[PDB]
């Protein structure tokens, strides 16, 4: 029949005898009210992973099958609410009021069902928008050592995307709920909770629910992507999902691989992350973009999980510790940071302004190393080092101060065309803000042309305005 008796219980796994007609992936329910997923079927005993606190489960307990595959409730009511990976409210405030349930075992958008990523996305950060542009539908990785700026950049991005309608989802995997509370409160404070959903997986909750969390997040997002919305999903630590699956595999007695992870690590993350796409015009035009994160010990790019996830994503933003403590924030290493959809995601004015900046910054870095070993350099090398030093200042930015795309191109054009020649490196940051104010109060028409056209204006008036501002600006 549809029921069976549990025969073993421990650490979240429970073999059962019976359950003759059970299907693979089917949800089952215990008398404790705790749900379970029937992952493996042997000849005479099912292997059940427990989706709740296992303390209440005993041998000889009956288990019943629901008759359906693993399903996550979805809808518009979830916006602004906090929920488990399962459809259970965590903030109280009554039920989640969801519309319908999407099976989370669905296939990805197939070949030729997509389109080239061309829709821009603005983080509000000069360095990221200028050097590593992101487009909608793209999957880009932000990676680095702990305490460097992962969640600061994710939250800055979510907050800056306030106008352009974008159903956003923020998945917390294996988190400390004080940080979940602080993130929720920052979203509410800056007025961004009204268009976000938060799914919570925390260490007190059993290990299987950490593995299900990003799957549930993407399954929630893909409802809005199928109906035609632009969507965003954030995974602030995929590394903790890897560990959860490593736990789940070993408890089922399965051999390891490199490091200690099993071989299915690539399959799991690829199965997850392939569901992000920019659907074709025949499908509706939705654009789900994912922003996963992984933490690398000692800031090491060359490891099993880091390179595993790097091979599945369309770009790298590398956060480096000694740059962070040197005062360069946000700390991004030009060399190891690049995007594989670059060029399309930038508006044409930005491309005309700066398209060689990243390569020239990596050249500045390697030349700084060569100067570190040597004593002194020739005149043109001095000039190159001088300009490369200035490029770093123009990309410094303070926390929680977003900038629109139009303002960036002014300062980047000033930098690339050599207008920061007479300004010492100490005064560059002051120059930036004074230039912002001067263009806001004197040179509005150029910014108007940029805003309406989406292209660079006639440079004569721009050059005259910059010269006039250089007349206004006082040097220390």
């Amino acid at each position: 029949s549809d029921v069976g008796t549990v025969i073993q219980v421990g650490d979240g796994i429970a073999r059962a005898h019976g359950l003759d007609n059970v299907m693979s992936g089917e949800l089952v329910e215990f008398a404790n009210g705790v749900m379970g997923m029937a992952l493996n079927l042997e000849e005479n005993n099912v292997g059940i992973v427990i989706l709740g606190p296992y303390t209440g489960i005993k041998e000889g307990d009956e288990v019943r099958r629901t008759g359906r595959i693993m399903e996550v409730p979805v809808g518009e009511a979830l916006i602004g609410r906090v929920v488990n990976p399962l459809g259970q409210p965590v903030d109280g405030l009554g039920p989640v009021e969801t519309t319908e349930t999407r099976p989370i075992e669905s296939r990805a958008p197939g070949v030729m069902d997509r389109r080239s990523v061309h829709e821009p996305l603005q983080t509000g950060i000069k360095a990221i928008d200028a050097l590593v542009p992101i487009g909608r539908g793209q999957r880009e990785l932000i990676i680095g050592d702990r305490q460097t700026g992962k969640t600061s950049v994710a939250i800055d991005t979510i907050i800056n995307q306030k106008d352009q309608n974008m159903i956003s989802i923020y998945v917390a995997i294996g988190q400390k709920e004080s940080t979940v509370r602080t993130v929720v409160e920052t979203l509410r404070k800056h007025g961004a909770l009204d268009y976000t959903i938060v799914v919570t997986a925390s260490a007190s909750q059993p290990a299987p629910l950490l593995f299900l969390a990003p799957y549930a997040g993407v399954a929630m997002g893909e409802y809005f992507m199928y109906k035609g919305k632009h969507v965003l999903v954030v995974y602030d630590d995929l590394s903790k999902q890897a560990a959860a699956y490593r736990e789940l595999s070993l408890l089922l007695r399965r051999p390891p691989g490199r490091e200690a992870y099993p071989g299915d690590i690539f399959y799991l993350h690829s199965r997850l992350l392939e569901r992000a796409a920019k659907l074709s015009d025949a499908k509706g035009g939705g654009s789900l973009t994912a922003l996963p994160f992984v933490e690398t010990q000692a800031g090491d790019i060359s490891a099993y999980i880091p390179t595993n996830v790097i091979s599945i994503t369309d770009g790298q933003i590398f956060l480096q510790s000694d740059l962070f403590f040197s005062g360069v924030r946000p700390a991004i290493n030009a060399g190891l940071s690049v995007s594989r959809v670059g060029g399309a995601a930038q508006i044409k004015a930005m491309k005309k302004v700066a398209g060689t900046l990243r390569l020239d910054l990596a050249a500045y870095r390697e030349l700084e190393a060569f100067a570190q070993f040597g004593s002194d350099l020739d005149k043109a090398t001095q000039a190159k080092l001088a300009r490369g030093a200035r490029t770093v200042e123009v990309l410094k930015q303070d926390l929680h101060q977003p900038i629109p795309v139009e303002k960036q191109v002014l300062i980047i054009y000033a930098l690339t065309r050599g207008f920061l020649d007479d300004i010492p490196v100490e005064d560059v940051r002051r120059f930036e803000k004074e230039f912002y104010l001067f263009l806001d109060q004197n040179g509005q028409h150029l910014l108007e042309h940029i805003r309406t056209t989406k292209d660079l204006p006639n440079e004569d008036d721009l050059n005259k305005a910059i010269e006039a501002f250089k007349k206004t600006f006082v040097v220390s």
């Binding site: 025969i7 073993q8 219980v9 421990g10 650490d11 073999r15 606190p53 296992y54 303390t55 209440g56 489960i57 005993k58 041998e59 000889g60 906090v82 965590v90 903030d91 109280g92 702990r146 305490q147 294996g174 400390k176 709920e177 004080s178 979940v180 509370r181 602080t182 409160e185 919570t200 925390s202 260490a203 007190s204 059993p206 290990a207 903790k240 560990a243 490593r246 736990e247 070993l250 408890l251 007695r253 390891p256 200690a260 010990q297 000692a298 000694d322 403590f325 040197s326 005062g327 570190q372 004593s375």
Partner: protein, 471 residues
């Protein structure tokens, strides 16, 4: 029959058989008491915790007391609940073990006192509350570059022989004996010599009247060493919830918790993982540390010591616990080999509080700049070795000149270091620290010799020291 027989014994682990229909739960406590009928047989005083239900009426358990002398056919008793440690106000000024029994040789807690379980789920999302407020302990480095957070976790990371316990004791002194508030102390995996020295130091300081203690020690079987911290936590929980009183919870060398879990899992039959660690490293850790939080009803501040197994900081246990903390001080060894105590890494140490609007604009403005100058010193050493005077020039030379002065000033004389030199310690307040570092950065005192800046408390003392030495 409610009672159950013992089928197998293997080290700490014991396998009990219960009649069908009367099996215990996962975290039940079981008791064994034996009447010896033969000269060969021995007296038994044993209680055990369930771990797994391994099917066919059999249950696998973990030893809390040593299993030597066990026999097959003995009768186990099911308490139907966990250890149920007695708790209340009765436990103030007493020393216990993991089972809830005192070891201070004073008396027996009455049989009608209320007792509560050790295992229970953590505070929910709605019940937590968040604020950042400084706790001032007077240690220059930790109060300038990484101030503590009331209601938050603090971690002391270091190897063997660095000073973690010296820091613990110094914090107990400076904070508890000059701020007040209920304290609980759990010695975990420590030399039992220090379980006596702390007792006597607190009594001769006169502070035991408002603290409780639990000790498990290395000697005990692996299960007790891990359950001890949870007993300390279940003690503090009653203070914070039912009495509504804030708690300061001290735990020493928390690594022994993971190490004992690893050993117990190896006994249990779980497959290995990582560097011999159990599969459930972060699940079993997170279940513990998620309960140490500040709800709206009351708060727990915890100061903990994390021992790094070797030179490798990237060991799974130090790495996984780093995700749970709020402020951390990492203890250097090369500074300790230079005698610059306390050997705290001024660049690896972190705190959630160091922000221009959480700890003060001026404090942050000086702190981040000093950290920048330290990072500048770190990278710039090579040019000095390779070429010396005519490459260490101009601004780098001046940076080195002031950085050498400011490097030693992070050192301070300690109260618990009176054994090592003949002079007492000093508690240095925040304002003085912030002003003193600034006065160094001005060059106001850079003509003083660099060695003077060691093991003093206020910037005027450095002029006094330079006059006393005549250098």
């Amino acid at each position: 029959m409610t009672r159950g027989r013992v089928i197998q014994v293997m080290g700490p682990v014991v396998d009990v058989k219960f009649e069908n229909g009367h099996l215990p739960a996962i975290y039940n406590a079981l008791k064994i008491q034996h009447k010896a009928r033969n000269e060969n047989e021995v007296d038994i005083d044993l209680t055990l915790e369930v771990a797994l239900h391994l099917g066919d009426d059999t249950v696998r358990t973990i030893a809390m007391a040593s299993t030597d002398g066990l026999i097959r056919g003995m009768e186990v008793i099911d308490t139907g609940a966990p250890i149920s440690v007695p708790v209340g106000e009765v436990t103030l000024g007493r020393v216990f073990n993991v089972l809830g029994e005192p070891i201070d040789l004073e008396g027996d807690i009455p049989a009608d006192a209320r007792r509560d379980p050790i295992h229970r789920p953590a505070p929910k999302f709605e019940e937590l509350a968040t604020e950042v407020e400084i706790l001032e302990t007077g240690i220059k480095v930790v109060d300038l570059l990484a101030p503590y957070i009331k209601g938050g976790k603090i971690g002391l990371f270091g190897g063997a022989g660095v000073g973690k316990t010296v820091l613990i004791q110094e914090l107990i002194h400076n904070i508890a004996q000059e701020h007040g508030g209920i304290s609980v102390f759990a010695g975990v995996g420590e030399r039992t010599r220090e379980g006596n020295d702390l007792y006597h130091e607190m009594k001769d300081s006169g502070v035991i009247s408002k603290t409780a203690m639990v000790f498990g020690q290395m000697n005990e079987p692996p299960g007790a060493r891990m359950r001890v911290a949870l007993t300390g936590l279940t003690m503090a929980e009653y203070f914070r919830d039912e009495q509504g009183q804030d708690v300061l919870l001290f735990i020493d060398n928390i690594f022994r918790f993971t190490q004992a879990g690893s050993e117990v899992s190896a006994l249990l039959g779980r497959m290995p993982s990582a560097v011999g660690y159990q599969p459930t490293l972060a699940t079993e850790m997170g279940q513990l540390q998620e309960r140490i939080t500040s709800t709206a009803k009351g708060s727990i501040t915890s100061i903990q010591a994390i021992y790094v197994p070797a030179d490798d900081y990237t060991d799974p246990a130090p790495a996984t616990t780093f995700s749970h903390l709020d402020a951390t001080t990492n203890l250097e060894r090369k500074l300790a080999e230079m005698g610059i105590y306390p050997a705290v890494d001024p660049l690896a140490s972190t705190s959630r509080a160091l922000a221009p609007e959480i700890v003060g604009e001026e404090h942050y403005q000086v702190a981040r700049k000093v950290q920048q100058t330290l990072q500048r010193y770190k990278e710039l050493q090579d040019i000095i070795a390779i070429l010396g005077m005519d490459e260490l020039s101009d601004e780098d030379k001046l940076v080195v000149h002031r950085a050498r002065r400011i490097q030693f000033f992070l050192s301070q004389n300690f109260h618990v270091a009176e054994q090592f030199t003949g002079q007492p310690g000093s508690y240095v307040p925040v304002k003085e620290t912030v002003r003193g570092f600034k006065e160094i950065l001005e060059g106001k005192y850079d003509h003083l010799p660099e060695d003077a800046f060691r093991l003093v408390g206020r910037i005027e003392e450095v002029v006094e020291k330079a006059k006393a030495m005549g250098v």
